Amino acid sequence: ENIRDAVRKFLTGSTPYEKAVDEFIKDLQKSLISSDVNVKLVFSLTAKIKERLNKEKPPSVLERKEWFISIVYDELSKLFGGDKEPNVNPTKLPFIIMLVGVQGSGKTTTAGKLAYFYKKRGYKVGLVAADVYRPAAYDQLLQLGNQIGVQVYGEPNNQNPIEIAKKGVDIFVKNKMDIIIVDTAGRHGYGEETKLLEEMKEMYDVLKPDDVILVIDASIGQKAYDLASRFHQASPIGSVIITKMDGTAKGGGALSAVVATGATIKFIGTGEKIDELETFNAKRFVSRILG
Ligand SMILES: Nc1nc2c(ncn2[C@@H]2O[C@H](COP(=O)(O)OP(=O)(O)O)[C@@H](O)[C@H]2O)c(=O)[nH]1
């Protein structure tokens, strides 16, 4: 968002177009690089911009400055996810959504937010606490459920996440929930991403969820590429939610990195409150950062 005031500087006029453009371009590069966006993506973005500038003459009836900003808007939009806005509604009821992610990525919180998101859309939602590796997670999700009138199945003394998840899903299915959101986890520690993907697959093979969602903490910046890519390869149907887009400068890096894998981002988390979840739209994200 540091570019917001930079874009303002460019638009309000000051210096002749060509000099002002070049100055904006370098400022853009500085901001993106500072947001941990991958260097190749930054330079490729700039080159495509010049290529558009140096090939698309704006009609005379339009302000050059305005036109240049539109192109930047367009190209930034592609960097952060394109124009296709994902479908987040169930394809059938009941609809089982499975959440996976490393420790601390905001999974439990995101489970709560997703429940709220769907409840506001008129769905009956059930939450399943199947994270057996962090003990306090059941109670944490329970408090989230209590906050929004959504029931939470859990078994605090059971160390088999698959048995819990399966029983949780079965009980919500029998009681006719529309949407069932399972909060899962793999083992912490060495090879956390390997343990995560193996545990995800075992759970997937038993639940047969309709939707698998990797939860990624934005604070890891462009390092999100590795897990998003391994997840995308292991689960071509899977999508991503990026959390804490409000608690770091590296959110740009995370978002662009995930996008570069070809994985779909369905929602972003924008804070600690249970209502702070939005469907992801790249153009809307760019408007906010452009001003
Ligand atoms: N600022 C911000 N904080 C978040 C967001 N999502 C989660 N958190 C915080 O991240 C911490 C861990 O979240 P949690 O759901 O417990 O992660 P988990 O360990 O993967 O289940 C908590 O302190 C949350 O308040 C978000 O979108 N924005």
UniProtKB/Swiss-Prot annotation:
It is found in: Cytoplasm. Its main location: cytoplasm. Keywords: Cytoplasm, GTP-binding, Hydrolase, Nucleotide-binding, Ribonucleoprotein, RNA-binding, Signal recognition particle. It catalyses: GTP + H2O = GDP + phosphate + H(+). Its EC number is 3.6.5.4. GO terms for molecular function: 7S RNA binding; ATP hydrolysis activity; GTP binding; GTPase activity. GTP binds at residues 101-108, 183-187, 243-246. GO terms for cellular component: signal recognition particle. Part of the signal recognition particle protein translocation system, which is composed of SRP and FtsY. Archaeal SRP consists of a 7S RNA molecule of 300 nucleotides and two protein subunits: SRP54 and SRP19. Composed of three domains: the N-terminal N domain, which is responsible for interactions with the ribosome, the central G domain, which binds GTP, and the C-terminal M domain, which binds the RNA and the signal sequence of the RNC. Belongs to the GTP-binding SRP family. SRP54 subfamily. This is Signal recognition particle 54 kDa protein. The gene is srp54. The chain holds residues 3 to 293 of 447 of the full protein.
